């Protein structure tokens, strides 16, 4: 399996209610390991996974100074974009930012990403080759020029291709207990008779990690995709995940349908019929 | 074309108020106020980007306050001014930090905070003609100007030959010396030198004038010593050529 | 987290000046250097990014070492006009430009041919003081304050007589005591031995 460390920053303005609320959270793969909350007491970046309390104060001071930097950038940017878009300081506006880095099974750098968003829509984003930007608007061009002039791309790449994947290796190596595990799904199929004619076949997958899993139905062997339902993978709470897929079938034909489960924690895919 | 700052120099007593105005380079979004103490480098006070605040955690809100309102010029107030506030107050405007992120500084606003205005007294100026013993040794003739007994250190000295200011052949002391060097509220003295050729000094139609500008009090300050109000003024001393 | 410059440097003409700026616990991506004169007002000079190394303009040579956490500033072919204080400045993200203290440079002039002398200047008919002038010595000589409390002596200073490619040193001593005289008012200093004292 491959791995990735990502950081998600959100900043929502509050007119008349003081400074905008800032929240930053960090993930390694699907496990959250740090957070910050401008309304919280400590005013300091907290841990959220045991293997990151391993760090001394040299580190926690840093991610606190750095996250306060992100915070006071988004603080200004909200006022900047409000002017960019000629909006009044009466509505609440939302700035988001995302960056991280992926590695292969050999933990070598694979791809990076950094990208910005205003009020739920794209704004600016590093190009996949990490050497130039894609502005989504006429306004974002002004940002693009500003950042082209400061060589920001040449420095986020340096962080993305270097420091980012090193600390990901550190993070994976420190928490090889948790981040490198592979919990396979505890699969089963339930059967709910709707009427005298149709019957619902629900195919569950509970308590697994990582969460990239694939559920599929197959009538007579070839893929069935009509009359199906597929809920979004959901967090259990204990750091595992749950997901199911249903299919509605005519009475008596239950055995024609087979659910197929694919996971990195599975040698070869599981297949389930009704019984 | 220039970053404007007011006033050049300002004298105020303790517990008073003072406000410095600054107009940045046309079109610069980022404006900074910096404080510069006697010998140190500039330390930031408050920093604007347009009409909003980027950094003012360094700004002692006990007394200092500043806002840009329009996003253009801004003013920096001190209510009230402590004696530790005497310093240079610099305004600067920059564009986006990058290949063109250079900062643009104004001439600075020299603040001097005093115990009482009782000691503020303007300078006395006098020039001393070149040595008649020198002009015959070398082929040059050097004048000397003395700016004595002024306080505070708010003096600009310039040399004017035949009505036009001159710079070539001039030294002025980089710093003044006190007349009672140990005294606390001590009164200052400064010196300067103008050197020209001998043939030039020996031409009597030629007029030399040393000019000291003093920066004292505005009219709002009140003088009740009945011994001539020491305000922003000019004190000069002259000499003509001698064949 | 600090920013250390130098501490009061001075060199001769022609020789190139090197000013150092070290920072600790930082990461800038941009360095800048400024020149401030007595009389206020920093004026920008050079601007060097982290991936570049060495940038030259005129006589200015600046370097930025990312890993050494240090920048070096060079004035080559130094002039006495170059004498002022010089400021280092870092650019910390997002837009915090923090300044170091000053390194004050003074480029002492190449005194071509010395001519040490102490002249008496004619008294002003309007002041009580008498003024002697110590001039035309090479920069090796150093000028000290006087041990008398009522005798004032100013530090030496350069004189760009531009019109005729001439520079000269000078230092002034004034006092109003009657028993004060030129022949030994600068006698708390190492005067060139062949220093001329004129005769009334």
């Amino acid at each position: 399996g491959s791995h990735s460390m990502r950081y998600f920053f959100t900043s929502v303005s509050r007119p008349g209610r003081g400074e905008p609320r800032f929240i930053a959270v960090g993930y390694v793969d699907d496990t959250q390991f740090v957070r910050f909350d401008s309304d919280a007491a400590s005013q300091r970046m907290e841990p959220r996974a045991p293997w990151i309390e391993q760090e001394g104060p040299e580190y926690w001071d840093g991610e606190t100074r750095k996250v306060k930097a992100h915070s006071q950038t988004h603080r200004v940017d909200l006022g900047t974009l409000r002017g960019y878009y000629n909006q009044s300081e009466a509505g609440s506006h939302t700035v988001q930012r995302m960056y991280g880095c992926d590695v292969g099974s050999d933990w070598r750098f694979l791809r990076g990403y950094h990208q910005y968003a205003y009020d739920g829509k794209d704004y600016i984003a590093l190009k996949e080759d990490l050497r130039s930007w894609t502005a989504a608007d006429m306004a974002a061009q002004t940002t693009k020029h500003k950042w082209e002039a400061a060589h920001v791309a040449e420095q986020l790449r340096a962080y993305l291709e270097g420091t980012c994947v090193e600390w990901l290796r550190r993070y994976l190596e420190n928490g090889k207990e948790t981040l490198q595990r592979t919990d396979a799904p505890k699969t089963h199929m339930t059967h709910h008779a709707v009427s005298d004619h149709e019957a619902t076949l629900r195919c569950w997958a509970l308590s697994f990690y990582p969460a990239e899993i694939t559920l599929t139905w197959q009538r007579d062997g070839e893929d069935q995709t009509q009359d199906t339902e597929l809920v979004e993978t959901r967090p259990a709470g204990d750091g595992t995940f749950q997901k199911w897929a249903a299919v509605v079938v005519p009475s008596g034909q239950e055995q024609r349908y087979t659910c197929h489960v694919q996971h990195e924690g599975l040698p070869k895919p599981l297949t389930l019929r009704w019984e | 074309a220039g970053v404007a700052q007011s006033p050049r120099y300002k004298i105020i007593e303790k517990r008073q108020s003072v406000a410095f105005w600054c107009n940045p380079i046309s079109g610069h979004a980022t404006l900074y106020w910096y404080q510069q103490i006697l010998g140190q480098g500039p330390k930031l006070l408050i920093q604007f980007q347009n009409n909003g605040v980027v950094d003012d955690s360094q700004l002692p809100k006990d007394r200092f306050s500043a806002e840009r309102l329009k996003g253009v010029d801004s003013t920096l107030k001190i209510q009230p001014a402590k004696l530790e506030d005497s310093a240079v107050y610099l305004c600067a405007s920059s564009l986006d930090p990058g290949d063109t992120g250079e900062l643009f500084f104004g001439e600075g606003s020299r603040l001097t905070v005093l115990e009482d205005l009782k000691n503020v007294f303007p300078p006395e100026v006098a020039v001393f003609e070149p040595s008649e013993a020198e002009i015959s040794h070398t082929q040059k003739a050097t004048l000397v100007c003395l700016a004595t007994g002024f306080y505070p250190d708010h003096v600009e000295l310039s040399w004017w030959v035949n009505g036009k200011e001159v710079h070539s052949g001039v030294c002025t002391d980089p710093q003044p010396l006190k007349e009672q060097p140990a005294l606390n509220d001590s009164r200052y003295a400064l010196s300067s030198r103008l050197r020209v050729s001998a043939t030039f000094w020996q031409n009597p139609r030629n007029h030399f004038r040393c000019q000291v500008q003093f920066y004292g009090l505005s009219e709002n300050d009140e003088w009740t010593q009945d011994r001539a109000k020491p305000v922003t003024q000019i004190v000069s001393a002259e000499a003509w050529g001698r064949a | 987290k600090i920013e250390q410059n130098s501490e009061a440097l001075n060199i001769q003409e022609g020789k190139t000046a090197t000013l150092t700026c070290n920072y600790t616990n930082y990461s800038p991506a941009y360095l800048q250097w400024y020149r401030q004169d007595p009389g206020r007002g920093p004026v920008f000079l050079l601007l060097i990014r982290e991936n570049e190394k060495e940038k030259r303009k005129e006589r200015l040579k600046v370097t930025f070492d990312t890993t050494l956490k240090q920048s070096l500033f060079h004035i080559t072919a130094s002039q006495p006009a170059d004498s002022a204080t010089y400021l280092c400045a870092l650019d910390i993200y997002p837009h915090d430009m923090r300044f170091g203290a000053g390194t004050r440079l003074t480029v002492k002039p190449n005194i071509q041919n010395p001519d040490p002398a102490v002249y008496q200047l004619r008294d002003s008919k309007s002041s009580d003081k008498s003024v002697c002038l110590f001039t035309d010595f090479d920069s090796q000589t150093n000028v000290s304050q006087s041990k008398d409390s009522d005798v004032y002596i100013t530090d030496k200073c350069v004189l760009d007589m531009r019109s005729m490619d001439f520079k000269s040193n000078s230092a002034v001593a004034w006092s109003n005591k009657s028993d004060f005289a030129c022949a030994n008012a600068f006698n708390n200093s190492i005067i060139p031995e062949d220093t001329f004292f004129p005769s009334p």
């Binding site: 930097a69 992100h70 940017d77 950042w147 920001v152 | - | -």
Partner: peptide, 9 residues
């Protein structure tokens, strides 16, 4: 260990 490279808009 997030980045230190954050700039304005």
């Amino acid at each position: 260990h997030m980045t230190e490279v954050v700039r304005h808009c």
